[PDB]
Amino acid sequence: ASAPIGSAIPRNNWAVTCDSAQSGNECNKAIDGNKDTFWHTFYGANGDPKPPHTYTIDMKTTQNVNGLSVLPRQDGNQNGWIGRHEVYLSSDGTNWGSPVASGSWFADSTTKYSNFETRPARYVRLVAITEANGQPWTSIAEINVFQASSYTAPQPGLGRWGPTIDLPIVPAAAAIEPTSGRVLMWSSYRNDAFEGSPGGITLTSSWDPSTGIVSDRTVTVTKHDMFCPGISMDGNGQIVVTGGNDAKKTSLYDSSSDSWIPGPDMQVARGYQSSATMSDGRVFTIGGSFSGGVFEKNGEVYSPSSKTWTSLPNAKVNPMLTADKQGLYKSDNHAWLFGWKKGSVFQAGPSTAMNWYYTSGSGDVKSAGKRQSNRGVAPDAMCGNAVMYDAVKGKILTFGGSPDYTDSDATTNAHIITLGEPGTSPNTVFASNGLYFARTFHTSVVLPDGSTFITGGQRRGIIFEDSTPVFTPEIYVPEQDTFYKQNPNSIVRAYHSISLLLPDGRVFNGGGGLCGDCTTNHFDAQIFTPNYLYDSNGNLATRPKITRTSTQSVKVGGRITISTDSSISKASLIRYGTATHTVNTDQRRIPLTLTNNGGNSYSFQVPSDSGVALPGYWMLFVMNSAGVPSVASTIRVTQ
Ligand SMILES: [Ca+2]
Ligand SMILES: [Cu+2]
Numbered sequence: 001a002s003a004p005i006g007s008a009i010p011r012n013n014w015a016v017t018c019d020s021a022q023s024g025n026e027c028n029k030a031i032d033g034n035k036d037t038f039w040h041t042f043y044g045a046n047g048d049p050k051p052p053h054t055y056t057i058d059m060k061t062t063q064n065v066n067g068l069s070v071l072p073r074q075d076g077n078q079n080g081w082i083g084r085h086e087v088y089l090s091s092d093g094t095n096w097g098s099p100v101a102s103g104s105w106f107a108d109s110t111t112k113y114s115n116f117e118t119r120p121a122r123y124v125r126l127v128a129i130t131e132a133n134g135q136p137w138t139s140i141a142e143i144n145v146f147q148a149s150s151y152t153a154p155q156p157g158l159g160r161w162g163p164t165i166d167l168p169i170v171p172a173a174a175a176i177e178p179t180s181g182r183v184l185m186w187s188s189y190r191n192d193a194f195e196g197s198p199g200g201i202t203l204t205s206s207w208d209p210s211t212g213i214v215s216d217r218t219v220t221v222t223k224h225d226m227f228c229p230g231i232s233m234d235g236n237g238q239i240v241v242t243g244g245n246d247a248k249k250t251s252l253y254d255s256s257s258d259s260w261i262p263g264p265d266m267q268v269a270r271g272y273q274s275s276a277t278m279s280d281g282r283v284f285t286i287g288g289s290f291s292g293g294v295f296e297k298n299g300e301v302y303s304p305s306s307k308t309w310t311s312l313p314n315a316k317v318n319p320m321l322t323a324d325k326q327g328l329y330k331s332d333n334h335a336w337l338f339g340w341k342k343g344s345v346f347q348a349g350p351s352t353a354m355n356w357y358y359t360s361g362s363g364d365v366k367s368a369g370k371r372q373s374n375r376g377v378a379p380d381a382m383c384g385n386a387v388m389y390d391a392v393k394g395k396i397l398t399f400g401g402s403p404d405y406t407d408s409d410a411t412t413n414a415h416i417i418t419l420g421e422p423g424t425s426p427n428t429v430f431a432s433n434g435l436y437f438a439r440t441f442h443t444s445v446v447l448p449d450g451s452t453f454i455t456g457g458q459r460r461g462i463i464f465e466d467s468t469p470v471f472t473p474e475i476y477v478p479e480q481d482t483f484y485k486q487n488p489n490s491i492v493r494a495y496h497s498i499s500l501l502l503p504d505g506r507v508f509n510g511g512g513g514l515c516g517d518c519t520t521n522h523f524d525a526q527i528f529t530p531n532y533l534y535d536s537n538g539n540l541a542t543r544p545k546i547t548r549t550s551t552q553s554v555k556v557g558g559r560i561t562i563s564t565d566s567s568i569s570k571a572s573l574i575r576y577g578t579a580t581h582t583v584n585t586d587q588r589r590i591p592l593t594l595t596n597n598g599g600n601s602y603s604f605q606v607p608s609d610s611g612v613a614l615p616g617y618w619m620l621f622v623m624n625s626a627g628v629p630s631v632a633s634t635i636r637v638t639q
Pocket of ligand 1: 031034141
């Protein structure tokens with residue numbers, strides 16, 4: 001069950017128009033307030049004209065519109081449920097612009113919502129592009145439009161939110177498919193529920209940024225309900241998804257063939273563990289007592305080439321536990337893991353105590369000191385975020401989280417940890433003056449220019465309650481050691497929400513909820529367009545282009561040569577991301593030091609240490625003197 005961001009606009013004076021209406025199922029039966037009457041397009045004697053069908057509302061005055069909702073017919077007949085759809089707003093009823101929301105609604109009879117940033121408008125149009133089962137018709141028992149209490153124009157310079165992407169599931173986990181550019185998402189055995197799973201099934205959905213298409217696919221071949229998993233992209237270019245609702249399983253998502261492949265069971269049953277890809281392309285995981293039982297779950301390691309997991313019992317979980325009020329059940333969850341040099345994995349929190357993990361022999365763990373600064377020792381920060389914004393200098397930015405997983409006040413703590421060699425205690429300092437808004441359950445991504453975007457969360461973590469929401473994102477800019485608030489959004493993104501960097505340099509931020517018939521399921525996502533894509537008039541800036549690359553698969557240590565259609569000042573590599581439960585151990589950034597060959601031709605070296613340039617897929621971005629990034633070119637990095 002979902003909910004709208006607004007309050008329903010009274011419909012007494014509306015005029016509505018539909019492409020067709022069966023008599024008895026007139027256009028205005030969708031706004032008579034009777035749930036047992038519906039609008040329905042032509043069928044029968046009138047022929048069965050096919051979608052797109054269109055429902056247009058003239059609301060007579062300008063309202064501060066922030067959603068609409070559609071109640072399907074309730075007579076047990078599925079005909080005319082809306083699948084693909086687009087929502088447009090207009091002030092003259094003639095010029096509609098770009099959709100403020102689009103995507104697909106799940107095929108059943110529950111009320112569907114489109115939630116989007118407030119926009120003043122007098123006319124609203126819903127286009128039903130497909131029917132949910134492929135049939136000719138559209139029907140709707142009640143359509144409502146919602147408004148916010150006010151409207152404030154976004155401020156120049158601080159980015160923009162929108163459009164909304166409407167989805168058939170809550171995307172509580174997601175990954176970019178690097179070879180196609182699509183956003184892959186999944187929930188669990190149900191579109192919005194995880195409890196009582198019979199195991200064996202994951203609902204997935206994908207959004208294609210370049211066609212805007214949302215599709216879906218029910219995955220049973222890996223016999224894995226993947227809610228609550230570790231996620232890493234391995235050196236063979238496959239995404240390893242572990243445990244969760246089926247605590248022993250491994251599923252492999254292969255972006256090239258766009259398919260799922262069974263992997264070998266883990267040695268230990270786990271849920272809510274973090275896994276991290278290693279400098280040799282293998283994947284390490286540790287902890288995870290959400291499923292498979294509560295007990296000490298020390299490290300293990302997955303080998304893509306031999307397809308085995310092997311236990312590393314001396315990579316001990318004890319040193320990284322938090323003091324969670326709930327004990328080991330929570331206290332070994334969501335470690336801030338980063339693969340680093342020579343097979344090591346750094347654990348940056350959420351526990352105060354940071355640790356080196358080693359994966360030779362049966363494993364090892366070594367204290368790396370406490371996360372702290374001149375302001376004191378940092379407390380446990382369960383579901384705080386950690387992001388490696390400069391792998392070449394070992395820089396990790398950490399921020400937010402709370403001492404307990406849930407029912408717990410979040411903080412504005414933030415640190416910069418600087419990694420050196422494995423086994424040495426890194427320098428950690430406070431980042432700037434901390435976050436503007438205390439938050440937990442927020443998500444974050446490093447952006448092409450090295451800044452880190454931070455969004456959503458709530459001030460006090462109370463899972464599934466969209467209370468104390470934080471609507472204003474922050475960006476940390478490391479060269480200034482400063483945070484900057486960005487334009488706010490209107491959809492709560494708290495527990496079970498995700499963010500990822502898209503190839504076109506925008507941020508995709510969605511989910512939140514996945515709690516059954518709770519009222520806080522967000523079956524959607526929105527795009528955030530950072531300010532670096534706008535010129536100083538607030539139009540989209542012209543972006544440099546990479547017109548050639550000399551290779552798109554390179555070995556650590558190797559050079560790449562590019563041509564561009566114009567001069568570039570900076571370049572960076574950003575490793576593709578994956579995301580669930582605040583955790584993303586896949587993204588990281590490498591700033592590139594460019595050789596200018598002349599004529600808009602440049603080279604750079606991929607760092608030769610593959611604990612820095614972790615093997616897998618990376619995005620190459622180049623930025624012009626104005627700071628505008630290109631869209632990414634995909635580079636596979638090997639070792
Ligand atoms: Ca009705
Ligand atoms: Cu969860």
